[PDB]
Design a protein around this nucleic acid. Structure first.
Ligand code: CL
Ligand code: ZN
Ligand code: ZN
Ligand code: ZN
Length: 121
DNA sequence: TGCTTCCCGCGAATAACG
DNA sequence: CGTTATTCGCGGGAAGCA
């Protein structure tokens, strides 16, 4: 089909026929396989570009709107994405958002229409 | 070398099904 | 509808890049 299976120990892995990348979940391999396949297009509704993954388009479109959903809770600065936010918190506040504390807040997306997680309210 | 985008397990929201 | 299958948002490390 589009993959074969591998089994080590009990573990089942799904392997991409084309690039031989390994996946624990089949939904993952299918999501990945569109990169080879290009059977689904995710075109940017603001410009030319097309993406092989829905989430790539979504990150892209937020950069069009300028919305800043990531807010540092120590000083209030807002950021476009996780990486800027984390980078800020680590350098300025000398803390890590990975472990434990709610150091930042992610606002619901309001600059465009995407699926909304009830926990962000 | 520090931004920048990619990656993929995980599971919530929604769609397709019956 | 209830009940499933599907989509895709998210974290945060990795990989890419100039
Ligand atoms: Cl904003
Ligand atoms: Zn592949
Ligand atoms: Zn665009
Ligand atoms: Zn701050």
């Amino acid at each position: 089909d589009d993959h074969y299976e591998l089994i080590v120990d009990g573990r089942v892995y799904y392997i991409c026929i084309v690039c031989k990348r390994s996946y624990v979940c089949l939904t993952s391999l299918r999501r990945h396989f569109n990169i080879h396949s290009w059977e689904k297009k995710y075109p940017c509704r603001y410009c030319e570009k097309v993406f092989p993954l829905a989430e790539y388009r979504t990150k892209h479109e937020i950069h069009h709107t300028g919305e800043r959903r990531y807010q540092c809770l120590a000083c209030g600065k807002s950021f476009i994405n996780y990486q800027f936010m984390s980078s800020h918190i680590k350098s300025v506040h000398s803390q890590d958002p990975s472990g434990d504390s709610k150091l930042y807040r992610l606002h619901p997306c309001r600059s465009l229409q995407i699926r909304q997680y009830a926990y962000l309210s």
